[PDB]
Design a protein around this ligand. Sequence first.
Ligand SMILES: CCCCCCCCCCCCO[C@@H]1O[C@H](CO)[C@@H](O[C@H]2O[C@H](CO)[C@@H](O)[C@H](O)[C@H]2O)[C@H](O)[C@H]1O
Ligand SMILES: CCCCCCCCCCCCO[C@@H]1O[C@H](CO)[C@@H](O[C@H]2O[C@H](CO)[C@@H](O)[C@H](O)[C@H]2O)[C@H](O)[C@H]1O
Ligand SMILES: CCCCCCCCCCCCO[C@@H]1O[C@H](CO)[C@@H](O[C@H]2O[C@H](CO)[C@@H](O)[C@H](O)[C@H]2O)[C@H](O)[C@H]1O
Ligand SMILES: *C(=O)CCCCCCCCCCCCC
Lengths: 67, 120, 547, 459, 170, 155, 46, 104
Amino acid sequence: AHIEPRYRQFPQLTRSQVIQAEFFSATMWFWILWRFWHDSDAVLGHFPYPDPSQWTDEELGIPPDDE
Amino acid sequence: GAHLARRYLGDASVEPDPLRMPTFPPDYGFPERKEREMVATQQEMNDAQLVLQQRDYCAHYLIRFLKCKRDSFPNFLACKHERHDWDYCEHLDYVKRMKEFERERRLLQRKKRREQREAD
Amino acid sequence: MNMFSSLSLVTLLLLTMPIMMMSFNTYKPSNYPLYVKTAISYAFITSMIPTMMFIHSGQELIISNWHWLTIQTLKLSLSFKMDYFSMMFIPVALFVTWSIMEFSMWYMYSDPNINKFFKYLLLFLITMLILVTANNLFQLFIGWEGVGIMSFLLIGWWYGRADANTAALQAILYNRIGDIGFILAMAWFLTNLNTWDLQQIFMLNPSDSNMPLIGLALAATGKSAQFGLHPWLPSAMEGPTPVSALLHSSTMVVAGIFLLIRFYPLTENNKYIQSITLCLGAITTLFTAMCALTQNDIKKIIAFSTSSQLGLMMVTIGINQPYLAFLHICTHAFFKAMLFMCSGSIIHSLNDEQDIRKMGGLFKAMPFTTTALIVGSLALTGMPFLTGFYSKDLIIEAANTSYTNAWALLMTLIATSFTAIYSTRIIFFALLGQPRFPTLVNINENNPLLINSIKRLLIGSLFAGYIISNNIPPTTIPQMTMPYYLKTTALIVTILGFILALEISNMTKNLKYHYPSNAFKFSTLLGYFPTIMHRLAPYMNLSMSQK
Amino acid sequence: MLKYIIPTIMLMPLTWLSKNNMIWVNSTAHSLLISFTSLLLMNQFGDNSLNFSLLFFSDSLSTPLLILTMWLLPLMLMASQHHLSKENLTRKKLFITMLISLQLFLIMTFTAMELILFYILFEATLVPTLIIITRWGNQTERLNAGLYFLFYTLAGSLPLLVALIYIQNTVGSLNFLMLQYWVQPVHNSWSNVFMWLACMMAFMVKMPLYGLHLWLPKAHVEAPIAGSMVLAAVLLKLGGYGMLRITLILNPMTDFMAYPFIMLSLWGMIMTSSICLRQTDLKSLIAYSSVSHMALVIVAILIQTPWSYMGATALMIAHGLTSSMLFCLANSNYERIHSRTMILARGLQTLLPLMATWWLLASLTNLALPPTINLIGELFVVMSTFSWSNITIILMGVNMVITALYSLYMLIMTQRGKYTYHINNISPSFTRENALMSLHILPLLLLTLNPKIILGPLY
Amino acid sequence: SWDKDVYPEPPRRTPAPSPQTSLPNPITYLTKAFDLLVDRPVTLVREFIERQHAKNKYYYYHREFRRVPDITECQEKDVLCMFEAEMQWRRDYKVDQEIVNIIQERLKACQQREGESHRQNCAKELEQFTQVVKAYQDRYHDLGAHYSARKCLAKQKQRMLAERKAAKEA
Amino acid sequence: ITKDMLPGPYPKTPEERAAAAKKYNMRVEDYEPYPDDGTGYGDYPKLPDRSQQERDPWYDWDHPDLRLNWGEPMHWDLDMYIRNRVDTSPTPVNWNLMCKHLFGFVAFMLFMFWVGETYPAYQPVGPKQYPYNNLYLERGGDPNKEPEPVVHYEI
Amino acid sequence: VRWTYARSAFGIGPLVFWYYVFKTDRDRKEKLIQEGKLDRTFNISY
Amino acid sequence: SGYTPEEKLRLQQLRELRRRWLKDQELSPREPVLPPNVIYKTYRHSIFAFTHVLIPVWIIHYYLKYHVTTKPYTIVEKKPRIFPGDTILETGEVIPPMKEFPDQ
Ligand SMILES: CCCCCCCCCCCCO[C@@H]1O[C@H](CO)[C@@H](O[C@H]2O[C@H](CO)[C@@H](O)[C@H](O)[C@H]2O)[C@H](O)[C@H]1O
Ligand SMILES: CCCCCCCCCCCCO[C@@H]1O[C@H](CO)[C@@H](O[C@H]2O[C@H](CO)[C@@H](O)[C@H](O)[C@H]2O)[C@H](O)[C@H]1O
Ligand SMILES: CCCCCCCCCCCCO[C@@H]1O[C@H](CO)[C@@H](O[C@H]2O[C@H](CO)[C@@H](O)[C@H](O)[C@H]2O)[C@H](O)[C@H]1O
Ligand SMILES: *C(=O)CCCCCCCCCCCCC
């Protein structure tokens, strides 16, 4: 047993587990920031969404009210 | 959307019915429309084995993207431009559908306005 | 095709070699579990070569190699369908199983029947690969019932415990109810068509497909534990933790969803079956998420997390997005298998304690388990660009913009918010706070088998979604134009779930005396479905038998 | 068929002329050789049957039943010798002689051309059967309880004899090959209704049909292990084999005369499976399990479609090997605890690890796990009865659920849980017992590789 | 190997490789590794076996069944003529089961081969399968487990009577 | 076992009721037969209808998994009350209230799903347009015929 | 022993019910087949 | 509310025997009496690849190439996708391009 149990105390830790836990915690955040920088559209929106109240009658081909 | 509250809570008479529209002649109100032009031939999509739902008015941009996807492997990051052209061409198609819905709604209001202009 | 097909079968044949060698061929019971892990690891490599060829040029095959039986005008052969779904699912399942087997090499170390445990996991994997690659319904049935029996033998692993034998028999009962739907489809396809082959079924493409598709929906309802046939999946926690990791990711529970994906050429043109599976999935995704809010057993929470995610998969089937349903099966297998391996790491350290009320203060005590649990939790809750986001995010966008049942859509969005609540519940009570576990501390996650097995899945839970979604070919037209408030709906309700869960968790610390609620008891006791159904239904049947 | 009749008879001189301590060795060895030569019957043809002579023939229906019959004699000898070891030598040879004579009547019964020759042998099999069950049975209770002998002979054997005698007068022959070409349709008529029942009631009781089945559980609780093996494996199939043959000359009256018997079978299929959940006696549980399985065979024979006849043949063989193995598994426990109660000895997997594997395999075949021929037969009958009426899928499906429930309940109660504390005489499984189980299951599983040789003539 | 007319397949059209990436294609390299480690050693073993086979050349034959009179020409209750006609009908029935199997195998091979275009490109296979299944159903469906030439003929004459009657109605 | 230690006919007289009570290792005041009818219970005791899950798990039972002592009379439906089957333990919520909340939840969700079909959600867009006469030929349409054309216009 | 001795020592109604369920179904199905109104285009297994 | 004097004495006497019994379950040093670095990991892996990959694929390739593929429709490929501008290997054919796209 390279780790002795303790009584009512915080367990003994190794450096290897702490470093690896930090490397993969920091990898997760690097990946999220790296992708958000390059693919922010995937979260906010790829293309503009038109407002149909703006389209004119000419382009929608709506005849005048007296025709 | 707000359009659903209008049709279910407000007046449904002046709201396009999604399952039956368009309910007006396509020419009506248009001095000579142009037909939609399809670039990819019908045998080309058959050879490319596109999914039928994908054989729409954008299939030429998908045929291009699928060709580049094959020809750039292993590089699975090699076709962002071909992919975006297909995506954009689909966005423009979706907007065209959004115009048809608005055109159908505006006309349904013109009919209503004219029906109640008469009885008045 | 000579290399594609040869390497497609060696992967299946290779997995059976440790089974054949059990007949004392150079047998080395010293390290049979290591031998099984190695075979899976090599099976993963060989399976990745056909996958690359499919990724490259979309190459696909059917291999009907052995003619088994002819019944007049119904020829039955051993036929493997090595297509899109088989290409991509097999490497994922083998990758996940490889980590679970290395984890089991440590978790099950002291079990005297260690060798028998690994043989059962290998058979449990083989019957799943028979299922996915099956090209006719009969061969699909062999795998379909195959996983069911291995579920029974692994759930009831500790066979001196009456609760384990009761949960093993419960899985069989609920699954054989679903198999009534499976045989109904087989009977209908044989009669109205003249085949059990998927090729002739899709070629004929019946329109009057209500009956065979209700049969498949029922079969998927039991196998993937949708509402109505759902209580067995939480009960299946009686099995050893490595069993739950496999059961809830790369094998049994996704078979029900996989079956409906196989038959998407039929469900495409049946708005009636689409409406049934949408509503069926929508209640499941919510109900099971609501149950998970008040559970205290760590394995029970994750088990309800699975039912809630399987419900979302069933919703995706019902909005006519079968390829997003498959993409979720693949991604979900990564972070869900990891969460079970993180729970087992905690359970093992605390001497077989599974109640989160007796955990706490583990954030620093178990640093690598903490890192994987946080990554797993964020991937489950659709944190942008982790493995879970590439499927969940598109599914919510596709559900929002479809011609859909309005109530099913609202129930699907609330279930997404609840996902953030019970995920927080695990992190808050297991990792934060002060320790609430006994005084003799045996916390030790320093084992290479534990570290390596979790590490590989952690890497998958980060990049697997991105790598897969960038390699699979387009089979649909993804709908990318849509209002901002529909685009960001999944992220927003996820964030409000996290905010809404911190307040609930923090109020547990106030020195105020709780008061039980009707809603709380409803969620704690699983809506009373087990208490009523599992007492009343056995009573009526068993009392009916004697008289 | 004389190459099987004559060697079978020669087992009697062999048994009576062996050294005193070689009776089991000698008869088992030579009866296994007869079983080996029975595989030459699989010289079947697509169009014609194997018609040896004026008396005997074989086709794809009788051939698998003959092979099963000849396989079972050595297995019965292996299963019987432990509990007959304290029996004196002259009574061991009489017991063996009863088994040999039972095989002699069975192989002749399955191959007879003439239906009257079939009738005499079909009844002669009861003489060795009742002697074995009563003379070597457990208790003083009468298997032929008097009521059952009367009901069967009055409502079964006698009406069948008169119907067969009547048919030969009208047709001029009862040779089955002739009946295939000279068969005439049966018109609606009160007299014809009674000919139909007369031709069928005897086989319905032997199957047994639900409502006429109470005799079977009683017989199993009394019989010695060999009796239960032959009774479950073969003797029930005599009724099934008879119906598959005699229905040739009963059309089209079977179109409507079969409804009550289909209803009894479809409902009784579920009622007997449920009874298996509340049985306290292993031999009774397996007996009620046989009633449930034979309900499918009756339905399959009565709807008479190509798929149901293929399913019926597969079911009869699969049940024969599975129910026989279940009785042997139960008997091995009984030879230690001397009780048929299923709750008495529990957690046996702890004490007998390999025997628990035989139990599991026996239970998986019983609940019809794919691709075992147990399922192949059951699936074919399910497929055919769905066409007969789609609603039947509900009853067929529910029975599949219940069958899985009592199969695993039997496995769980006896093999799992905590062992019983005071039972301290569970000795390790003998080589004889392990070999007896493996000779049941290995052929049963090997047939999955080549199912066509058990699918009958309709294949 | 088989007969190309019975089990037809259209000519294969595989596009030439047209790479557009400087990265090596790992599939092409694995293909050479396969063609060297697997195919050639396998081919050598087979060629040796086929050498032994060429030394010993013996032939087997496909049995031919001369035609005999059908059940329609048999006298009533004349078993000698009914027997041969009955056996011939069973042989034809078994052959017809395999003709339907061939047509189904074409239909299934077509669907997989055509991929996403199968609905249009397998219409000829679907039509042929439809007509053969119709013809088989006309002959042999609903005869029962105790089918025979006699019952097949009774079904046909009943169908012929209905066809003849509907002609008058016309 | 003798015939006097076995189940017998229904007890008529208090003397017999005592004899059966002793036969079953029960005291006379505890013993009661089932109602005398055609059910055929005989003189077998009618014991409380409770599952074995209600019995003291800590007591040193002779049969620990069945929680039964040796010589103790076995409830008639015992095999239905073993720890693997029917359980009758007291529930934290009254049985009747549990049924109303479960059924009320299923009833309210089924109703709401019906309303969701009646008033579906959808986006404000016209139908998706396809070329070549709505893909008449691709969808397997008959090529000997000519479809009545479908024309799509630019907007 | 006493327990298993006692243990080892609705009716037609469901049969009548199921008779009418199946008899009615098969009469409706039989009528449709004679009127050609039942789809059996690909049904050749039975 | 505690142990009676006899209860303590019986417990003590069973403690002596129970603890002696458990001590007797320990194994003697001789028991059981049985009857009569990169390269290593590479050799174990190299021998595993040979026995569990190379031999199986030799048998599978032989089986497919000479026994399965020689029967019709046993291995059915999906036909390769042909895109405009391709060159067919079998015939040398040249698939034409698509029309000129409108500007976008
Ligand atoms: C379909 C036909 C297939 C034909 C297959 C022909 C058989 C070829 C296999 C021969 C060698 C098998 O060898 C079998 O597997 C591995 C090989 O390392 C051995 O296992 C060995 O390696 C593993 C790890 O690699 C160790 O955990 C184990 O301690 C060690 O003994 C088994 O103990 C041996 O029984
Ligand atoms: C598992 C073990 C089972 C053992 C029992 C089965 C094995 C028996 C194998 C014997 C097979 C012999 O098969 C036999 O081969 C010889 C090869 O010359 C053929 O011989 C014949 O063929 C051709 C011309 O006809 C000539 O080459 C030869 O002169 C001629 O005699 C026979 O026509 C064939 O029937
Ligand atoms: C995602 C949204 C989910 C929302 C689901 C909402 C529907 C589920 C409703 C379950 C509760 C129904 O509640 C129904 O009325 C009350 C309690 O409410 C119960 O009856 C009784 O309950 C409690 C306790 O006795 C009393 O306070 C109440 O006054 C009384 O009526 C009924 O037995 C039940 O039928
Ligand atoms: C407008 O954009 C429609 C699509 C967005 C989600 C609609 C939300 C539906 C609200 C719940 C109504 C439930 C009725 C049963």
